[PDB]
Design a protein around this ligand. Sequence first.
Ligand code: FES
Lengths: 82, 101, 175, 46, 162, 130, 191
Amino acid sequence: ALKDPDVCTDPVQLTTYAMGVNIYKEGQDVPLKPDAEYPEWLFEMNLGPPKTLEELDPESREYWRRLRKQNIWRHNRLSKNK
Amino acid sequence: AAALARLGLRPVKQVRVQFCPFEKNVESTRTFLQTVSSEKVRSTNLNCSVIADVRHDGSEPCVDVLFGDGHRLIMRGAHLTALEMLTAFASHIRARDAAGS
Amino acid sequence: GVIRAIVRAGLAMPGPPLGPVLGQRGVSINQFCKEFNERTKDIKEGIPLPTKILVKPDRTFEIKIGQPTVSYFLKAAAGIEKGARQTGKEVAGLVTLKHVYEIARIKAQDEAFALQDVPLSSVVRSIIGSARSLGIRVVKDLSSEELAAFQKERAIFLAAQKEADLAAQEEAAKK
Amino acid sequence: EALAGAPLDNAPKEYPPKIQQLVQDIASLTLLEISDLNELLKKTLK
Amino acid sequence: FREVVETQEGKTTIIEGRITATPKESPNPPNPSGQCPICRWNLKHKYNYDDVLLLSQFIRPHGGMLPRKITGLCQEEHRKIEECVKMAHRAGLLPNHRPRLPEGVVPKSKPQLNRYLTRWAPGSVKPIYKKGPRWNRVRMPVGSPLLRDNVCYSRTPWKLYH
Amino acid sequence: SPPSPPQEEIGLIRLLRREIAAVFQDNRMIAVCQNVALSAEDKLLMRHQLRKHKILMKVFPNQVLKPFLEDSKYQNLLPLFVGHNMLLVSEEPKVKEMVRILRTVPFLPLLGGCIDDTILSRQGFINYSK
Amino acid sequence: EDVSIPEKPKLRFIERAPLVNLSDIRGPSTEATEFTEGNFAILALGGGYLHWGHFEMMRLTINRSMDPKNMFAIWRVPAPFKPITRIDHYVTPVKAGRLVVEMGGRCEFEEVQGFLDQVAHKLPFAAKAVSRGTLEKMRKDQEERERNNQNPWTFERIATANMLGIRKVLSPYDLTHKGKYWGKFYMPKRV
RNA sequence: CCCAUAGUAGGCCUAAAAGCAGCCACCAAUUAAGAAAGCGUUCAAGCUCAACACAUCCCAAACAUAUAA
Ligand code: FES
């Protein structure tokens, strides 16, 4: 079975030094650079629940991808019988 | 692709599918190319190959097939449907396969 | 065919689960663990690494290594050792957006993204969806103080849930 | 307003109308005039 | 009309199609509004199984039916003509629209039972050994129900069961 | 039959048309190929090599492209598209890099390439590579 | 998502006997003809008594086939009250045009029709699964047939005027039924 | 008809649950492809679909086509 090493839990260290970010034994956790250096879009990423069709712009690729997923779901529900 | 894939290009040696894409009457030949170029149809005989060349001289699309014991078969796509070429082609190779073994 | 089974770095085992899989193919088993353990030597022993095996009909095998799963990155990035039992109702961990971006950076170097050939923005957009599955909430400006109280309560709550699980284990032994 | 048809590979090369018109004008111009023109063109390249 | 050919010469076979002129539709249909050929010519409900001149136009040289898309017939008329062609064949009205006989087959003479308005293929039908009582009598179908709407020039409607 | 009112264009249809209005703008050269029969694993490596050569392989329905070509200046592009089609785009003209990879797959034919805002046949495209 | 499932989605159990009349199954139903908080239902097209045995069959089938979260079912039939002496057993009379069972929730008629229609064929009387749109089309279609009927002679006109002394061979109830209902059996095609 | 790449084998549990004993989720890459609608697995895999592109012995005889009386 798969075994994972225990993660040391210090609040300051975890934020500054993520163990997961570093995968090699020789390397060390990657520190976080100032916020300004990081891309602005990172801060604009959506953290909320999946947007409904009304929220999404109608003429947008995501809107019709969401519409397509919903339509396939509708077929799934009908196909449940067989 | 499915139909031919069941048969397999065993007794064939090479194919030729010359067509001028600009010409309107090349639709049938290109559809024929898809079937023969199908991985399922081709994989059957890695040794066997296919030529699908492309030109812009205005020549009518032509399909020429190379075999071993069987004589070469040439089909002109301009006045042939893709299904008729495939079914007639499959019949020819089947007879050649019987002759070989 | 092709076999893609996640294997911990340097912990490849001839026995199950990957063991019997190789036996059916007929490819050498010991050779895999030998080459794999020697190829992931630098990587920490125990890192979830998706591995793809290119098996020819001749049974010749060419191993393929990828970047670790997103779960491992996010988990440690918060300090959490085990994800949440329930999603949306409890928060497993607290990671900044930076942490999601840092994982996206090193995670975009894998084979999957090369094929997916998407931009940097999409990379993060796909890791925020995994963190939610784990329960890990992302906050623009998390603070050490907030992190300390949140993690401490979760750890104690996880111990309480572990105690409930332990009680169920006793019932399972009874039945 | 519409792109011209691709020439056949066998067919001789076809040249845009503008290119053909320019060739005729160069011959009429004197070498001394051409020499003055040539000097300005070289500077633009570098 | 496209006739595929094949010529084996010089140890090679060439397959090519030949486009030939076809029979043009008669000019000025009486009712140009009609969607399909039958209504366009005021022929709806006005043709029977023995109108070979009308039915022959919608069948292949070997007696097979032509697709609806190619002919343009509406689904209702397509099924009517399809049944009429079946009865026309079974009655011997179309003796030149049969598959060509190759060299292998031998000319043979077998019982030629004259029949007409045959709804079912002779082989499939089974004898009516028990007719049954008068209130529940097993009848013998004659003609087709699809032609029940045909123009009737008599005070008695067609009997479809005998 | 009563003529039906014209069907409204789906938003996806507009999105596909909007994408086309950027392909030519973004990538100077767009190439058309027809053989999609190639296996997925070979296809994946083909795109991966294209990325190594800064080229992108994408497939779009001709249902929307065909009307656009009739309206766009490249009307002569329309005949090439038939059945299954795919597009290769690269802002920088990596013509030689593309051609040498296509040569490795005989059953995959390059119908034509629209480069430098000019419809060029495959035979002429080779000369351009040199 | 707007629809809300009650705390008890699956159909509740029906008592075999009450805790404590051939006309009952004859004619059009005057109650339970309209959907209540449910789009789909099983429409009774005939008149027959329902003993507990049927209730257990319908409840078992509907419950297992239906998904609790997706949809809910509400009983429209009361408990068996009529005494049948061979009391040997208790039954529930259902008149024609009555909705025996109703199905409402996050589902479509095609999804619902499958199990509802299957249960319907078991009922001792003719029944067909119906939906709001379907049932309204059924009633709207019936009204269209009456208005556009080309026959100048109708059962109601002949029966009400007693033309040909027809009332000698007809029941008094036929004046209200108008020939659509013959005993327990109901004839939909009749105008 | 066509064809179904993949994060990843989602988390949690499950000896085992890899779309698919269950639970919780049902987010996402691609122009597109349901954490999955079936079938199928010890679990996998495999196979389709939704997507992309394209009880002596039957019982009148008969009859379809001449203006309902
Ligand atoms: S549509 Fe008029 S007869 Fe076919």
